[PDB]
Structure formats: C-alpha cells, structure tokens
Amino acid sequence: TEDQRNEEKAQREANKKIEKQLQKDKQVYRATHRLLLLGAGESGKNTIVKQMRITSGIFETKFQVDKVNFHMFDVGAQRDERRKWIQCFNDVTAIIFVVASSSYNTNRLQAALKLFDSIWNNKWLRDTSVILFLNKQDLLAEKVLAGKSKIEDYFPEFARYTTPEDATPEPGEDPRVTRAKYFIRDEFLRISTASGDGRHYCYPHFTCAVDTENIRRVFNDCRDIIQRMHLRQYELL
Amino acid sequence: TASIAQARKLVEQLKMEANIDRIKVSKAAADLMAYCEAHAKEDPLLTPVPASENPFR
Amino acid sequence: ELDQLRQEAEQLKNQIRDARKACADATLSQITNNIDPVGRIQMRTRRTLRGHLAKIYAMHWGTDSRLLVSASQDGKLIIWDSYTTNKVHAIPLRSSWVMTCAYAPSGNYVACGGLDNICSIYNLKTREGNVRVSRELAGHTGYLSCCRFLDDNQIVTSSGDTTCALWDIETGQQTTTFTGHTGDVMSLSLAPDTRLFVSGACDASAKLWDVREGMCRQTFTGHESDINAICFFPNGNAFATGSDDATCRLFDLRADQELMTYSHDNIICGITSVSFSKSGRLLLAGYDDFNCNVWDALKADRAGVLAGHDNRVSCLGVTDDGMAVATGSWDSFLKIWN
Amino acid sequence: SFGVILAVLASLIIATNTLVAVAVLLLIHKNDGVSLCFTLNLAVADTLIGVAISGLLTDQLSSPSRPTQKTLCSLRMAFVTSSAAASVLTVMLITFDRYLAIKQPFRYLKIMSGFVAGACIAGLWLVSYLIGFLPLGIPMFQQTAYKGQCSFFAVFHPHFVLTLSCVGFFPAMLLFVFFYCDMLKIASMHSQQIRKMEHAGAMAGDFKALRTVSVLIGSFALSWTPFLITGIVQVACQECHLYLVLERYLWLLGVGNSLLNPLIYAYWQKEVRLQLYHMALGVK
Amino acid sequence: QVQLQESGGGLVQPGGSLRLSCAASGFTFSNYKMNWVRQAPGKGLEWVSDISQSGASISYTGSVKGRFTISRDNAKNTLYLQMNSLKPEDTAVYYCARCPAPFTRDCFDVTSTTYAYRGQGTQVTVSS
Ligand SMILES: CC[C@@H](Oc1ccc(C(=O)C2CC2)cc1)c1nc(-c2ccc(C(=O)N[C@H](C)CO)c(F)c2)no1
C-alpha cells in the first residue's frame, strides 16, 4: 500500500503548512484589542465614530494608538431584541457605552440605566468592563443652568443629594451644573459598585461629541484594565 | 393595517391548521417502538463494537 | 374588529386543544414501561483536535463519516480528517462573527454565516487548488443562525429576522420565503426526505414547514422559553427539541402533540444542542454546565454522561454511520467520543 | 541522625516537586500559556537538587575514605552547586516576566511567545550548569586536598563563595527588591482609585499587597544570605576557625528553600490548586 | 403555551385609586422575575416597575416612586399593581411582562417589536 504512505506524507505536509499559518495568525490575533461600541441611537455615538475614523449587520473601524491596534465593532441593521447576539461579544476587551446625559424629559435616562444594569448582570458578560461616556454635556449644562426641566421631577432623590467632597469640577462651571453631572455619574456608579465580585470595573468619563481626547481616554482605560487583572492574579490586588 | 392584518393572517393560518386530521397516540408509540427495536442491531453506540472494525482505536 | 378577531382566534385555539386532547388515549411512558432498559453506557474520547485560537461555534459531520468542518470566532473555518486528526483546509472568513456552518452531501461546498447578515458558499474543489468564495447570499436582515444544504444548488437558511428562506445558489435569489414566526429563529432540521423541515424560534413554538408548497403546516407549543436546538427523528415521524428551561421534549408529527419530556431537578442550565443516534434509541443533549447527557429515548432515564470539556458545549453531532459522536466547546477543542 | 534527616529532607523535595510538575504539565496541555512554562521549569529544577542531595547522602552514611575521593567530591559538590543556581535563577525569571507583564502591558503581548520562553530556559540551564563545574577548572577557587571526606569548603576555596556572593546573590537580590517594591507602588494607585469610587457609590445609594510582597521577599532573603555572609566573614577574618561546623549545619536553609518554592509560586494560583485537588479526587 | 391576561382598568377621576391584576399560565410561575410596563399614546414602551422571584427585591421608576406598589402571589400565580393618587399623565395601556429565562436577574423585556412573553394589556385613563 505504497499509495497509502504517499498520501499520508502529503497529508502530513499539509498539516505542517497549516500549523505554521495558524501560529502566525495566533501571533497577530493575540496583539489586537477588540472593543464593542454600544449606546442608544439618539445618543452621539455616530459623531463619536465619525471623529475616531478621521445593509450589513455590523460595522468595523480600525485605528492605531502608539503602534497599538484597536478594532471597534458597532452593531447596526439588527432588530431591537439583544438577548441573543449580545452573547457573541463575551471576549471583547471593553464595552464603550455612550449615554446622553441631557436626555431626561419618553424618559431615556431610565432606559439607559436599565440597559446598563442588564448588561452588567448578564451571565456571559461578568468578566467584561464598561467604559461609560456621559456624552452631550453642553446641552445638559444649558438645560439645567436656566430652564423649567427639574431632575427632581423624574429623580426625586436629586432633591437630597450634595456634591461629593472629592469633586474636581472644570473651572468655570456653576455649582448646579456640577451637582447635576455628579448626580448622574453617581446614579450610574450605584449599579456598578453593587456586584462586589471585583472581576470587572467601570470607568466613567465626562465627554462631548467633539472632544478630541476621547481616543486617548480609551487607550488609557484599556491599560488600566489589563494591569488590574494581572495584579489580581499575583495576589497584589 | 399591520395590527389588524397580522391578526387576520393568524386567524386564517389557525383555521388552516384546524382543517388537518389527527391520529391516536397509541399507534404512534407502537410505530416508534417498532422502529427502535427493528434497527437495534445497527447502532455501534448502543451496543459495543469490537476493536477490529472500530476506526477510532 | 380586533376584539372579534382575537376572540375568534381564542375559540379556534380552544378547539385545537380539545381536538388534541381527544387523541391522548395513553402516555408513551406507560406503553414503553415494559421494554428492557439500556443500562449504563460509558463512552470514551478517542481523539482530540486542536488548532483553534478561540472558542468554537459550529460543526457538521461529513456524509462519509470521515471529514468534518468547524467554525470559530477567530475568523477560521477548519476541515479535519477525523481518523488521523490531520487538517485538510483552513479557510479564513471575511467576518469574524460566524455562528453556523454546514457541509454539503456531495462534499464540494461549505457554507457559513453570522452577524454580517450574509451566507457565504465556499468551493473546496477548485482546479487551481485554492478555496474561493463561490457565492454570497445577502437578502436577509438579521443574523444567520442556521443553514443546511438540500443539494448542490439549493440551500435553506434561517435568520434572526423571524423568516426562513430557500435560496437557489446559482441565481443567488430567494426562491421562497417562509414567514409566520414571532421571535428570532434559532435552529433548523431537514427531514430525511428533504420535503419538509422544522424550526424553533425563541417564542416557545416549533413550526413544521413544507419546502415545495412554501407555507406552514403545523405548530407545536409545548415549551416555556426560547428553543435553541431541534432534531428530526430517524424515521421521520417525530422530532426532539431543547430550550432554555433545561428540558427536552419529543413531539410527534402525526398525533400532533407532545409525547414525552426529559428533565431533572438538579439541572437548571439551558440546552445548546440535540441529536439522535442511528437507531433513534438514544438522545444526546449538550448543556451549559460543561458536560453532555445521554438519555434513553423511551424510558426517559439518564443513561450516561460525557464530562471531558471545561467550558460551554455549543455544538454536537452524530455521524451518518453511527460510529462516533463529536462535540465542540468554548474551550477551542473538538472531542470525538465512541 | 544527620543521615536520616538528610534523607527525609531530600525525599520531601522530590515528592512535592514532582507532583507539582505533573500538575503543571497537565495544566499546560489543557490550557495554553507561556507564564506556566517557567513555573514548570522551576518545579523541575527544584527536584534535581533533591536528587543531588541523595547522591551525596551515601557518602556521609559510611566511611568516605577513598583514593579518588577528590575526583569524586569535586563532581558531587559541583553538581549540588550547579543545581542550586538552577533554582535561584529560575525565580529571577518569574519575577522579571510578571513585572514586565504589569509595567508595560501593551508590549508584553506583542513580544512574549513560546519560543522566547524556551530560549530563556535553555540559557538559564546552560548558565546554571556553567557556574557549578567552573571551580573544577580555574584553580584560584580550588583547595589542596587534605582528608578523604566531603565538604563544600574541603574542595572549593572560600574565595569561590566570596566571588559568588559579590557577583551572584546580592546583584539578584537588589533587582528583586526593586521590582517588588515598584510593583507595590504601581498597585497602590489602583487600590486608591477603586476605593475612591465605592465610597461615592455607597453615598449615592490595602494590606493584601503588603503581606504578599514581604513573603516573596523574605523567602528569597532567608535562603542563602546566612551562608554567604558566614563565608565572607571567614574570608575576611580567618581567625574564626570555628566556621566549618556551622557551614556544615547552616547550608540546609538554602536547600530548605526548595520546600517553599513549590508552595508559593505553584500552590497559590487558583488553576494549579484546583487541578491538584481534581487529581487528588481521582487518586482517592 | 405561555398565557398572560391583564384585568382591571377603565376610567378614574384624578386623585383616585386603582388596582391592576395579571394572571399567568403555561409556565412555572415561581421561577421567573416579573414586571409591569406601560405605553402612553404617541409614545413607546416605558418601564414602570419590577419584582423578583420571591419578592425580596422590588424596583420602581422615578416618576412612580412612593405612589404605586407591586406584589406577586405564587400560590395562585398572580401579579398585582396597586396605584393611587393618579395624574393625567398616567393615562396609558399597562402590560404584564416576564423575563425571558428563569433563574437569572437580567431582563430585555421592553422591546418595541413583538415581545413573545407579554400579555394584551389593560387600558387605564385618568381625567375629569
Ligand atoms: C555556594 C552557595 C550555594 O550555591 C549557590 C548559591 C547561590 C547562587 C547564585 O546566586 C547564582 C545566581 C545563581 C549559586 C549557587 C551552595 N552551597 C552549597 C553547599 C553544599 C554542601 C555543603 C557541605 O559542606 N555539606 C556537608 C557535606 C554536609 O554537612 C556546603 F557547605 C554548601 N551548595 O550550593
């Protein structure tokens, strides 16, 4: 059966070639960082992706920061039931969740909070971290500075809330604007700090749709995530 | 339109399904057992297979 | 009109339920209580195929029971020669979010699709020797969840937009469209005659569809939650289903009602796959608790367990010959038990 | 009863390090990872040392009188010395790896792979084996034979200990201390950041890093320090003729360290602990 | 088949009180977290309140806090929402929704498209 041995040798050669190619592919695949961009349509995520770039069911954007490769996936042209395809994103490095702060009157802020809680408590997404972009700050500042829209109407607890002592307001903001901003941030943090597992954390940020630092922020946040996981393995944290 | 059209289509399809005939459960169970017993000797998993022919050894 | 139509539909559903109950003369367990139990069967892993960088989402056995195909989220579709474990092909995918795969009965084409809303047909036997994208089907509006070959020129696809389709590969246009579901369609299963099929779509209902007539025939509503996996019985007169409620069920096409249910108190994890054996006596079900169970299809007693994996089990499959059963899992390995 | 105690101490090492190594192997096969490889290497280098001890035990268990006793002892000693540097140089590779994995986390994924780990381990073994038999060459580090027994100093001059301590241990101790004390400062900022957010969360509606950096430093420190310090004292002031018995009964600490390496680096990780339990369950 | 039926509703003058009931059949009632949602004319679905399996954890929306109350009776598989001190903005259709899978605390049950596990609803209008 010399033909059997000949075909076996050919098969072994094919296996070796495929193994070499897969080793190269693993090398490339281990050094690329995957991020999932999520957020309501009315939010400014569209402008965010447009700034970062400067019928398909998913959109990909690739960028480089300090010779590091980030691939950002944006989910479009899909229906509004997320309980099945979201599970496909249980390996990404971070979920960039963009929420429009100046959204409270439907009541969009509560819907965003419910979505954040659902993502946070999911079974397959308990090891993923969230980078939270409180977009559209200028609109919120204008609305609260002089207007008839009371956050207390939709969030009664706001009437009994005072700014945290360790607050770093931007120079030039009226105290009410800072109070509203930090109320919203703390509202989002209440969900994040409740779990207590310590496997994943949240990284809040105050951002505008035109901020040019956003890219950098993501970069920095990513580093922290990695570091922390390593510091958890070696019993340092 | 869509709200009432969906209900109309559902009613029509339900009527169509109701037009079908049915069989007793006992006959279906008997047929299933007959098929299960007739081919019981051709399942390598159900009954052990000697290593002479088992390719995965 | 809406109230009247709803009341009429409720009355018709009550009539359907009464008609079904009329035929429930006896239970399958009572009739099958006399047959001899299978006992205990301990399958062992005869192989272990490595090479995937990330977890594994699908696999389909070959028609000859010697080659198999697997898909992963590292953008890789790999064809294994099971007997020796040597790789034959490693196709790279354009989109890394691949959720299903299939292997044509003629062994000349391979299909794959996912979140990109497209189904790609790859040629494995080009004269040049390289695998090339034979066709792309891009008429859906939701993620592709399952697809199967009818022959070398017809493919049935299931998507998450609540409608299945039958495509002519040559022309690239939907020959037929099947509608009637409410939620996302997940699973799919061609009949042995290639004349009918079934589908469970995340609303606790499995519908039976006629391929040539292009319309639904019957609906089964026994489950409580989403349906993830569905399989046809070897004979062609029944099918088994599994859902997130951690219970499997066996429906009969002719009696038009559920026959038996397999479940246990200590199992609270959803089923990801289901498949019968060649004789139809055993029922293998893969779970999220890292091990797959083997049930007696007539006695409904847990007969065996396979516990070689360390993560979620996503795909399972018995061969055409009944020689072995393959399983893939989120740990990036493929095991072949026998 | 020095022979019995030495035998026991050499058997413990072999058993524990072999079991660790087997578990590590299994884990490497199941789950892939470069970080594991260096651990396995350690669990290997920490068992040969025990074997080496066993080889020397038979000499002390009876009369060692012989003509080639010096040709023999030169090889025994050199084996033991070479084997110790294989367990001291392995620890300085886990620290470097796990420090580069935290200081620069974006480059550590684009650089480290299996080939780098293999090359580093080959170089480590070569250098470890080149340091022990070296005294068998150059004669500055040798001593003229007097008796037919075996002792580190009986064959090797104390100048060899002096050079080892001044080019060996201490340079590898300073680096260890710096690495561990910088990772601590890196891990304090993260602790502060994560602790300043739970307070805000609660309002709306620490010692771990210090008890873990001290064990890893104290264990390294109290392994060979006493021996090298004693040797340096002897070299500086030869009048302290009483140092040989001490050096005969002080070296154990060094070899004693091999009973903590497989319990600080391999039994503190969750994967290896769970693996060992799982294997034990099958053993029962 | 999962069946959910809402009862109680109609017309109420401002400042009154009302009680909505939801009856469930076709599934093990005690294993599923449940909630009440609502839809006002010209507006999409909104989340009103939710309750867990055993009732230990309860949540309400901000605009409702201190007014409504949600309870569940697992002995007879029923859900109750007691509302008081109504206002004109509460005029809407109320739906009784269930989380998709059991033994979990994640939920995706507000989707505008046809959600397969919610009842037909009950109409409540508050006006002079
Ligand atoms: C020389 C110190 C130590 O070896 C090393 C320490 C550190 C390093 C490094 O830092 C290098 C970077 C890697 C290298 C080698 C050693 N001592 C002994 C030893 C063995 C036996 C006796 C003895 O006489 N025993 C009698 C017969 C029983 O009563 C002894 F005195 C010393 N082996 O290794």
Taking the domains of chain B in order of start, what are their residue ranges? 3-57
- Give the gap in angstroms from C-alpha C83 to the nearest C-alpha of chain B: 6
CATH of the domain at A172: 3.40.50.300
Can you give the three-state secondary structure of C91-134, one letter per residue? EECCCCCEEEEEECCCCCEEEEEECCCCEEEEECCCCCCCCEEE
Sheet of A59-64, strands arranged across: A59-64, A69-74, A32-39, A94-100, A129-135, A202-206
Of D37, E47, B31, A43, which is closest to residue C233 (Cα–Cα)? B31
- Answer yes or no: do D101 and A201 touch at CB < 8 A: no
Amino acid in the structure at residue D48: L
Give the residue numbers spanning the domain of A41: 1-237
Residue E35, beta-bridge partner list = E50, E97
Is the Cβ of C73 closer than 8 Å to some Cβ of chain A? yes
C57: left (phi over 0), alpha (psi -120 to 50) or beta: alpha
Choose the closest CB to A237 out of D202, D204, D208. D208
The upper half-sphere exposure of residue D125, i.e. CA atoms within 13 Å in the direction of its Cβ, equals 12
Can you give the three-state secondary structure of D162-209, one letter per residue? HHHHHHHHHHHHHHHHHHHHHHHHHHHHHHHHHHHHHHHHHHHCCCCC
How far is Cα C10 from Cα D45, in angstroms, rounded to an integer?
Answer: 77
> Chain C residue closest to E31 (CA)?
C245
D57 touches D2 (CB < 8 A):
no
- Answer yes or no: do E61 and A153 touch at CB < 8 A: no
Choose the closest CB to C245 out of E102, E116, E120. E102
Integer CA distances (angstroms), A55 to A58, A88, C142, C157, in order:
9, 20, 10, 18
Q: What is the DSSP letter of A198?
A: -
The data reach a resolution, in angstroms, of: 3.3
Amino acid in the structure at residue B21: D
- Answer yes or no: do D203 and A31 touch at CB < 8 A: no
Neighbours of chain B (3+ CB pairs under 8 A): C
Q: Which H or E run includes C163?
A: strand C163-168
Sheet of E17-25, strands arranged across: E3-7, E17-25, E78-84, E69-73
Q: Give D212 Cα–ligand 1 centroid separation in angstroms.
A: 27
Of C189, C16, C6, B20, which is closest to residue E1 (Cα–Cα)? C16
CB atoms near residue C7 (< 10 Å): 10
Q: Do chains E and D touch (3 or more CB pairs under 8 A)?
A: no
- Size of chain D in residues: 284
**Residue A37 backbone phi and psi in degrees, to 5:** -90, 125
> Chain A residue closest to E64 (CA)?
A154
- Answer yes or no: do E100 and C221 touch at CB < 8 A: no
E94 touches E48 (CB < 8 A):
yes
| A35, A74, A85: best to mutate for the C interface, most C CBs within 10 A | A85
| Nearest-atom index, ligand 1, CA of D80 | 33
Amino acid in the structure at residue D127: V
How far is Cα A136 from Cα A99, in angstroms, rounded to an integer?
Answer: 8
- Counting other chains too, the contacts that B41-44 makes at CB distance below 8 Å and 24 or more residues apart are B42/C278, B42/C279, B42/C322, B43/C277, B43/C278, B43/C279, B43/C281, B43/C282, B43/C322, B44/C278, B44/C321, B44/C322, B44/C323, B44/C324, B44/C338
Q: Give C18 Cα–ligand 1 centroid separation in angstroms.
A: 90
How far is Cα C128 from Cα C105, in angstroms, rounded to an integer?
Answer: 22
- Give the gap in angstroms from C-alpha E1 to the nearest C-alpha of chain C: 6
- Answer yes or no: do A224 and D190 touch at CB < 8 A: yes
**Residue D177 backbone phi and psi in degrees, to 5:** -60, -45
Of E89, E39, E33, E32, which is closest to residue E64 (Cα–Cα)? E89
Is the Cβ of C139 closer than 8 Å to some Cβ of chain E? no
| Nearest-atom index, ligand 1, CA of D228 | 2
D10 touches D54 (CB < 8 A):
yes
How far is Cα E66 from Cα E75, in angstroms, rounded to an integer?
Answer: 27
D152: left (phi over 0), alpha (psi -120 to 50) or beta: alpha
Q: What is the DSSP letter of A43?
A: S
Q: Is the CB of D253 under 6 A from ligand 1?
A: no
Is the Cβ of A147 closer than 8 Å to some Cβ of chain E? no
Instruction: State the total domains in chain A.
Output: 1
Cβ-based contacts of A228 with chain D (< 8 Å): 190, 194
- Answer yes or no: do B25 and C235 touch at CB < 8 A: no
Can you give the three-state secondary structure of chain D, one letter per residue? CHHHHHHHHHHHHHHHHHHHHHHHHHHHHHCCCHHHHHHHHHHHHHHHHHHHHHHHHHHHCCCCCCCCHHHHHHHHHHHHHHHHHHHHHHHHHHHHHHHHHHHCCCCHHHHCCHHHHHHHHHHHHHHHHHHHCHHHCCCCCECCCCCCCCCHHHHECHHHHHHHHHHHHHHHHHHHHHHHHHHHHHHHHHHHHHHHHHHHHHHHCCCCCCCCCCHHHHHHHHHHHHHHHHHHHHHHCCCCCCHHHHHHHHCHHHHHHHHCHHHHCCCCCHHHHHHHHHHHHHHC
**Residue C146 backbone phi and psi in degrees, to 5:** -160, 150
Q: Is the CB of D220 under 6 A from ligand 1?
A: no
How far is Cα C245 from Cα E2, in angstroms, rounded to an integer?
Answer: 13
Neighbours of chain D (3+ CB pairs under 8 A): A
Is the Cβ of E112 closer than 8 Å to some Cβ of chain C? no
How far is Cα A201 from Cα A226, in angstroms, rounded to an integer?
Answer: 11
Q: Is the CB of D80 under 6 A from ligand 1?
A: yes
Q: Which H or E run includes C30?
A: helix C28-32
Residues 6+ apart with CB under 8 A from A190: D201, D204, D205
Is the Cβ of B13 closer than 8 Å to some Cβ of chain C? yes
Is the Cβ of C97 closer than 8 Å to some Cβ of chain A? yes
Q: Is the CB of D55 under 6 A from ligand 1?
A: no
**Residue C329 backbone phi and psi in degrees, to 5:** -150, 165
Integer CA distances (angstroms), C143 to A18, C98, D198, E115, in order:
30, 9, 39, 18
- Give the gap in angstroms from C-alpha A67 to the nearest C-alpha of chain D: 10
Q: Is the CB of D99 under 6 A from ligand 1?
A: no
Q: Is the CB of D168 under 6 A from ligand 1?
A: yes
Q: Is the CB of D225 under 6 A from ligand 1?
A: no
| A117, A220, A235: best to mutate for the D interface, most D CBs within 10 A | A235
- Answer yes or no: do E61 and A110 touch at CB < 8 A: yes
The residue assigned the tokens 């009483």 is: D242
- Answer yes or no: do C224 and E103 touch at CB < 8 A: no
Q: Which pair of tokens denotes residue C187? A: 């699973």
Of C78, C26, C30, C15, which is closest to residue C52 (Cα–Cα)? C78
Of D200, D201, D81, which is closest to residue A193 (Cα–Cα)? D201
Q: Which pair of tokens denotes residue D257? A: 């360290």
Q: How far apart are the first and last CA of chain B?
A: 64
Atom 34 in ligand 1: residue holding the nearest Cα = D81
Domain B3-57 has CATH 3.40.50.720: no
